[PDB]
Amino acid sequence: NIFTPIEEALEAYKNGEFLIVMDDEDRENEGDLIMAAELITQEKMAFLVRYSSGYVCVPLSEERANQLELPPMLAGTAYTITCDFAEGTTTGISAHDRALTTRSLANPNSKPQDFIKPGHILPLRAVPGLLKKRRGHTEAAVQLSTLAGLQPAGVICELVRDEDGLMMRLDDCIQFGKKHGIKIININQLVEYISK
Amino acid sequence: NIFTPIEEALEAYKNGEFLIVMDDEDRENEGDLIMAAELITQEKMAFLVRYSSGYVCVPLSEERANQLELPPMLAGTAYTITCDFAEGTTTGISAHDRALTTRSLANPNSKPQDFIKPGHILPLRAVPGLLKKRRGHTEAAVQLSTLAGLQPAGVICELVRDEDGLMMRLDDCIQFGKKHGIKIININQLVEYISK
Secondary structure, eight states: OOSOOHHHHHHHHHTTOOEEEESSSOTTOBOEEEEEGGGOOHHHHHHHHHTBOSOOEEEEEHHHHHHTTOOBSOOOOOBBOOEEESTTOSSSOSHHHHHHHHHHHHOTTOOGGGEEEEEEEEEEEEOTTGGGTOOOHHHHHHHHHHHTTSOSBEEEEEBBOTTTOOBOBHHHHHHHHHHHTOEEEEHHHHHHHHHO | OOSOOHHHHHHHHHTTOOEEEESSSOTTOBOEEEEEGGGOOHHHHHHHHHTBOSOOEEEEEHHHHHHTTOOBSOOOOOBBOOEEESTTOSSSOSHHHHHHHHHHHHOTTOOGGGEEEEEEEEEEEEOTTGGGTOOOHHHHHHHHHHHTTSOSBEEEEEBBOTTTOOBOBHHHHHHHHHHHTOOEEEHHHHHHHHOO
16 A cells, blocks of 8 residues: 555656655655656756756666776766767756756767766665665665566656755655655565566 | 846855856847855755756865765766765655765765765865866856855756757856846856956
8 A cells, every 4th residue: 555566657757757766665765756768858957956866876787887987987986987979068057958968878879088086976786686685775766667568777866845944754755656646666676676 | 237246146045046158248148047046945856856957066176075985977067976075865865865964975074985986976076276277167156156155066957948858058047047046147247246
């Protein structure tokens, strides 16, 4: 009565909707908004920023980050050097620009030279094996995209309360989901699905 | 009747108030919130994140950044490797943690090993000579703190509209300033003060 069945959630994700993702069923878990990187529009990015910490990250597989030449920032942490898609952006931080950069990181035709580093988007490297190897939200994002038949790339950010800036716990996430019509799932629930 | 005189603005800044900073008087400029890094509280950081892009940066002098061992992210906005103050933080992204990290970057007693890298705060390296060398908002932040007799460190973020996520131009900044009782100034105005 709280979490959406994985198959229904994947269809929403495939259709470009956000999903509120918790670690498991615990009431104290803090929720993050996650959606397909290739489908995030200017409006959807504006929505993500409006209700989150604004530290917008783009989970990518290690293989993809390597192809785009996005090495770890230091030669859930595991950050790579930041970046902005060159053509089509100006300040890089605008909703339009961050959305464009995010979609570009997912686009198979994108090339390393297409990006400016540093930038305003924080790509994240998901470990091989995804959720079966590490139950991080980074792995969850790439796992969702993969299950949805999309490019192995997602975009995420922490939900925050407008009243005091505190991260949204389960109760507040449930409220947020009903108000905005966003389905909620948890990683434990997702791991069980992919495992059996 | 729009921009506050620099001396009055400095007193507000000195008292821990935010300042809305524009490049010059042009109505098309986008405004950023800037305040002293050492005075940013949990509440003020929550406020900053609530009305901004959330890509919160912490301008520091190149000399201070070197002392804290925060080298440029890559070897233009001079981003350093990101960081989180270790003791007292958990997720690093919370308003409490980001404010603590920001105050710590300003604290002259802080040491290189006190921070974890990468992190959730984006330090920026202000060029020597500040606004007399480069008119960036980074230099402006450090210049404001210096003129206020505070540590050469500031914290900034871009104001964004709640309706569509577009950055606030002058008109919206004036409305924002009056609604929250925040003074507005511009760089050209500041350079003139420090000159002559």
